């Protein structure tokens with residue numbers, strides 16, 4: 244699996260489009276991808292629900308989640324579900340492993356979530372699942388994100404089960420992806436996927 248075989252594709256996960264294509268309408272935080280998207284309008288909207296049915300995973304498990312924080316998590320979903328530029332990190336259903344996120348992306352996400360609350364530092368398993376929605380298990384204290392995720396890297400990496408890696412590279416280095424970008428400026432991740440598909 245290699246080279247161009249990896250550019251402009253969508254992972255084989257349950258919601259993804261079979262190939263990327265333009266979308267006339269995508270919802271709010273997913274707008275940057277509408278040029279060429281792996282997500283449908285439906286998915287984009289479902290990404291913005293209080294508890295997205297895409298994963299049935301509640302971010303409000305500790306009640307106190309700041310809007311600035313939740314915004315980052317929604318953008319992360321759009322990135323995951325919409326990006327046509329993840330091919331080089333796709334691995335076997337398919338998924339993504341260690342997509343390198345630029346330092347600013349992890350930094351800002353962390354900074355904006357410091358004041359919000361969670362009860363676990365590893366979200367990949369060990370939840371109480373009685374309502375079809377996850378709850379904090381017995382003994383898991385709700386504390387600030389900065390307690391369970393001491394650093395930006397912890398947050399980037401452990402919330403999404405190693406889909407993302409906190410890159411030491413910065414934005415516009417050509418060596419890391421942004422999880423969100425201003426639509427007007429064009430997709431800076433195209434160049435990065437292209438680079439990694441060659442090596």
Ligand SMILES: [Cl-]
Nearest residue numbers: 326327328432
């Ligand atoms: Cl992208």
